[PDB]
Enzyme design. Structure first.
Site, PDB file in Angstrom:
ATOM      1  N   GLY J  60       9.278 -48.779  -7.145  1.00 20.92           N
ATOM      2  CA  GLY J  60       8.382 -49.680  -6.429  1.00 20.92           C
ATOM      3  C   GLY J  60       8.540 -49.545  -4.927  1.00 20.92           C
ATOM      4  N   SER J  89      12.318 -43.122  -9.466  1.00 22.52           N
ATOM      5  CA  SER J  89      12.023 -43.275  -8.040  1.00 22.52           C
ATOM      6  C   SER J  89      13.083 -44.132  -7.329  1.00 22.52           C
ATOM      7  CB  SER J  89      10.602 -43.824  -7.843  1.00 22.52           C
ATOM      8  OG  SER J  89      10.201 -43.740  -6.487  1.00 22.52           O
ATOM      9  N   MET J  90      12.673 -45.264  -6.755  1.00 25.50           N
ATOM     10  CA  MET J  90      13.597 -46.169  -6.063  1.00 25.50           C
ATOM     11  C   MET J  90      14.630 -46.770  -7.018  1.00 25.50           C
ATOM     12  SD  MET J  90      14.266 -46.868  -2.918  1.00 25.50           S
ATOM     13  CE  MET J  90      12.927 -45.715  -2.629  1.00 25.50           C
ATOM     14  N   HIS J 114      11.741 -38.285  -7.247  1.00 18.58           N
ATOM     15  CA  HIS J 114      10.611 -37.651  -6.559  1.00 18.58           C
ATOM     16  C   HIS J 114      10.499 -38.171  -5.151  1.00 18.58           C
ATOM     17  CE1 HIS J 114       7.643 -40.957  -8.206  1.00 18.58           C
ATOM     18  NE2 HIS J 114       8.330 -41.398  -7.138  1.00 18.58           N
ATOM     19  N   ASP J 163       7.638 -34.719  -9.470  1.00 19.44           N
ATOM     20  CA  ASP J 163       8.339 -35.540 -10.463  1.00 19.44           C
ATOM     21  C   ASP J 163       9.411 -34.728 -11.188  1.00 19.44           C
ATOM     22  OD1 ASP J 163       6.761 -37.696  -9.755  1.00 19.44           O
ATOM     23  OD2 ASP J 163       5.935 -38.030 -11.751  1.00 19.44           O
TER      24      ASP J 163
END
Lengths: 184, 184, 184, 184, 184, 184, 184, 184, 184, 184, 184
Positions: J60, J89-90, J114, J163
């Site tokens: 997010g 991700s995060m 990513h 990704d």
């Protein structure tokens, strides 16, 4: 809804006191977060007594499903799985994930297995990455299902190609459950 | 819009009289059907005199693009390509598709190359089929570009990985066009 | 709308007979395709007599604007530009693009200049490519404006930073037009 | 709609043959482009005979209106303006723009004048730019109205602060029209 | 769009004069009705000279598809089929439906075959009827494909289970076309 | 769309010249009005030569269908009916409505028969009125179908209870058509 | 749609030449304006020969219906009415409105009569006005029906209280039509 | 809503204290999960005293319904079923699922039985699978209904083909309930 | 909303303590489920003291209404009904359902009776079933109203044909209530 | 949902009692605010005992993630990170952010890395600012990842371009986690 | 969410007990009202002990921000500000508004400054008023920032013209914060 006399619990909280967890919806991150939390809580309360996980689910997120799966295997207590109504897709995967000899379905409960669903949009390269990822995810699912049912990987691959609906007895024969619960 | 004195034509019909075809939109089946029909008509009128295809297009459907491409290569007349404004994606592919020595861009026209875009939804197997198809489509596009620009397949692959914007002169240097038209 | 007695033309088709082209809308690929086609048509009719391009436009697509721009510079006839109402953004760029000594605006017509607008979404790398492209597009626009107004690139850069509204006389002083047309 | 016997004209095209232009809609770039084209066409047909412009408009785009205004003043033929129903805002501006001694309104036609409308969004600096532009636009409008009515700039400013509805005779008294047409 | 000098035809009407029919859209009742009418018209003009059907279609309605198929087989003239761009689903069925020895595809044209798609909603009994009908439709399609390609029904069934993309040369090897057209 | 050389007709107008009427859509009031008008026109031209009605329709409005039906029976010329693609519901009713001995279907055309569909909302009394009306409408449809096929009212009732899909040969056996057309 | 050989008419224009007007839609102001205009046109062509009005309509606006009704009664020629498919509500009113002895329905045409429909919103006083208006409108309709059928006002009131569906022969018995057309 | 004096319960929680479960909505996974949890809770409190299940339901999910059904049959306490208002579809199935001799309906309560509803979309193969599944589900439902009513499978099939509405007394005669409760 | 001093209740729970039930909404399954539960709760508390049901309702679901109706008649305590504001349709039915001698309405409260409303869509057979069901529902409603008011079935049928508004005193005269409450 | 016996907690509150924080959703400002508050609370309770952060997140907001990241690094207690299901991700950044030696993933948990995603719209200058910001944000993210995994910045940049999906064991090999937890 | 053991608090309430206020959302009237009330509450509890305001905000309403700002300056206790994640626009304004020597940011937190945003629609006079107000608002913001950072007004004006992103250490150098918090 319904509240229970004891302090005030909702019906599910009262069942949780008896080490019963009710999965009766689609599997998403919110639902997985709740199921995992209840499993961790029950281990903390008693690491010896087993847990009862009722399953009535059309499935949902594979990753959310694996959060539940891995937690089930990690914790010390045995987790009994009981299928009521329907355990489809990732629901049936979690059903097969119960402690050996302790996976159940009620006589009219249905079990459905099929291959994972997904999407991919964008550049050819991006689509390739998403395709490889879902294919690898399917391989992971099929390998685990193979170990838990006794069926070969190649058979699982074949039997999950399209929607495969199984009766409780067929699910037993398949190795997805150990016993179908006869009325007590 | 505009009508022209001669019977009555629209402005594009009058230009078709001089063997000029204007591609000034996104490429879809409707547009491809129109361009292909115009190419077939002009060949029937005169199979010797060459045709002038002006290209101002952001691209669009690859299969629709290939309907135009194959029609260009099949007909006897040379098809000159002239880039005005922008030839992006399948637009730049058709620009490179013109008769050898007869591919042009105006001095301030832009040329963009990248990899094909697409989508896939459903079962892992269905996604795999869609991924394999777009990858094969990209290979087809890169091979033809290789032959038409003189560039190696590896260089085309690398240069089309992301959006690649080219000036008219850079497009000439790349081999996408033959000459940038100097003001007459 | 209105039809004209001669065969039957619409009002714009009758004006095209006298080598007048009316740009009275936003600039997109459809409008650009029509303007380009009219310029090519008029050159084929007579490559010696000049063309009159009336401009009342808020601007629009830069690439579509360059399709018109390059066509103006490529064709042999002088293209006279006449601003009526408003020439803003890419509209004013095309106004400044007319044949030297033959760029006009009516006394109350407005001219607006600013920097190009755009968008970017996705990965940091993708946003970088889009940023570099629009910055390079701005440099191209400013360089040509510099050549056509007599102003420096650095002055154009500063004056286009924000919305810059100019009266007809201010546009003449700036070098965007050559003369403001006095009532005849 | 309706067609006329002669070749086939629509009702407005037949009226244009007699040098009558009908403005019976809101003023935008499309309408302005048509009116200007009609004005240029009629001058080319005969630069001596005057033109009749009927106005039934709630107004609209100021810049589009100025395209019509400047064309009226530029061409050699006198442009008679006749208000029917309502000339509001930029419509009343174009009414006052008719040839001196030749601006008319029918007895029950209404005329409305007010200050220009617009919008601004974004940074404080951007809002400031848009505010200065609309204020400068109002000055230009009020200055021209001053020359055409005989009223001072200070009175126009006061009278256009809010919606100001005028009867045909009040519009004559104000100097917006020269004569209210009596039934013939 | 574009008009052609002769009276005035649109581009497709001019091509119809040379016994060419362009199918460049999805197949529905409207399109089928038009293609059937063109086929009937061309036979009435000359029952001896063959017809040329260009196909660029993603398919569509199976019944609309069969209206065209049956008309092709009924009429006396040979109907040559030429795939440009893509012939998918019912589009590829119609491609295979051309006169034997006269079915073509351009070098980069794509051909896709798969099983028919549909839907059913309501009572279990209603779903059964819809299921039987689509299954019988698939049998009808596969049987005809078998006779026209030379492939066995069992192989067709297997090859159409999922989306199956074929190059022009693969389509020839399969028996869907007779020859890939080499550039003339 | 396509235009035909002769004056200018569209493809359906040219076929109407040969007494061919094309029904290739759903049946509504607009379509029925057009079909009725074509039937009346053809009788006025020649009351002796028979008419050819091609039918590709999913059905639609019963009342609109009866407008066509009654016109077919009223006019003197024999109306030949030819099913291409599909004649479903009211479409198959009109197919069976053709002149005896002159009702055809192409080999792969489908015929579907079922009971009429409708709706009712409001008071119980209003619902009763709408129910009686549709039931009486069904009786009328079945009675006429009985007269035209030779099948009993009671058999029709049973056979139309649910969607009943018939092949061309099954439609012939049923008495809906007289012959299935063999390729010429 | 279809065009007719003669100059070019549409199908309805060709029928109008034979004094046939087709009403095949809902009755609104647009339709009424067209039907009235056709009746006036035919009277001006020949005031002696009768007119044929085919009716297939679910009704619509009462005032629009009365525009048609009053025009039928005003003009000199007899207006024959022929019901095909359905004549409901204001449709059936116009059917009964035909010249005496010359009102027809085809054997399977339906006729429906009921009371007028409407709405009211606002103050009690406003609702009172709207109610009084629709009641007076019903009385106007019921009187004319009484005069044209031969039935008493009290019977019409009772028979139009709810949706009343009538067969062709029942419509003849009622007095709404004079004769049901037997196949010719 | 309403809270009850005792700690604070809602009205349904207070009734649960007296072993009363209210099913007054459509059956979905959420409702089933709640009903099952309430049944398990009451068994844990007292496995000897019977439970009272009030049913006012239009039905819903079959699998959710079976989750409730199987839980009813599994637990030791008798589950009394009492129909109030309406028990339709899966609602009526659960009504018939109550302990033998303890299935009730109030005098004016309605009972509706019919075949299961569903959907299917996609490939013919996928539609086949979905059809087979719903047909097998119907067989399971009809078999269980046969055992619980005393009616033959063939009669259940015929009686559930369409919507079958039964009064309380008719439901007793059918074997769906044991007794209709007379006012106390 | 408002809370009451005692533990904390809402305003309706405090009234429930005094055996007062407030029906102040439309009747649906949720509302019926709540009212029924309150009636069952109050009987369990004291089966001798009568219950007070205030009714302000436009009606709603007939089946939901009968759930309330039958629960009123089943339980031992007298259920007094008091109309405030409006009891319409099923609301007025429940008002008449109160204990004989104990049905009330305040002087300005309104009572409305009409026939049940419903809807049906689909096959003629399906519409017939739905029509028979709503007609039988009306007969059941009318029969019960006949017993409870003292009016004949034929009179109820006639009076409920359209919306029939009654004053409190007219409702008493009719037999729907026993006494209009005079200010205390 | 579920409540726990002790006062009343929800399941997450009871786990917080044992210093367990559950991140089982996307990362936004609300979630960050909650996680930070929980980390600050647990430090205030005991600054010596370590905290357990379970992570199942698709990522997010980067800034919201850094609020959590910086709070983790600031406080005295070690923060153990345990990946269940997916850390993307995060989410994977926060997984890597755990105390060295105390970063875990369960055997079937997924880890995805990513580059950051974003958007930009408006003037070329504004797009430049946004591009520079996201590029600098990526540099910040890659630099920290370099410190925490042991991989070079150049490798991180390369591996995060698209990704990149990692198994638990691959995440260990990469240095994102220290150990994959084997079932206890 | 989470509840805390002590009575029951939510996580933020427990932190408020330690004089910690969490701003973790956009700034609007609701949030401002909450923050102001918390500041007023904490002063009433203890006017000597300082308050800790954590800021993670993208800004929002300028007036709502000033309600917080003025309350911070009014109350006697020092208000320490701590930036976590992001302080943008009015968020960064409130960050700089903390007690001098007591303004902090965590090492990876971001600070963004720019000019106020707004909108205006209507008459030129109305737009002028709105422009003057936002320009005056910016002057107020810049003046206060100048006071609190030590930078000149002219520098603030220049630095806030466009989006200006700052790292924690840049924010310290600028004077927006006093110190970046080093890990403890």
């Amino acid at each position: 809804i319904p509240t229970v006399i004891e302090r005030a619990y909702d019906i599910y909280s009262r069942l949780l006191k008896d080490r019963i967890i009710m999965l009766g919806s689609q599997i998403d991150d919110n639902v997985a977060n709740s199921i995992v939390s209840q499993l961790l809580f029950l281990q903390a309360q008693d690491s010896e007594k087993d847990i009862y996980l009722y399953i009535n689910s059309p499935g949902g997120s594979v990753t959310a499903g694996f959060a539940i799966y891995d937690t089930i295997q990690h914790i010390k207590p045995d987790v009994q799985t009981i299928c009521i109504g329907m355990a489809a897709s990732m629901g049936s995967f979690l059903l097969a994930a119960g402690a050996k000899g302790k996976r159940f379905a009620l006589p009219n409960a249905e079990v459905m297995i099929h291959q994972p669903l997904g999407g991919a949009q964008g550049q050819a390269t991006e689509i390739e990455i998403a395709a490889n990822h879902i294919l690898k995810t399917r391989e992971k699912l099929n390998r685990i299902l193979s170990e838990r049912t006794g069926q070969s990987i190649e058979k699982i691959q074949k039997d999950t190609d399209r929607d495969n609906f199984l009766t409780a007895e067929e699910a037993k024969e398949y190795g997805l459950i150990d016993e179908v619960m006869v009325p007590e």
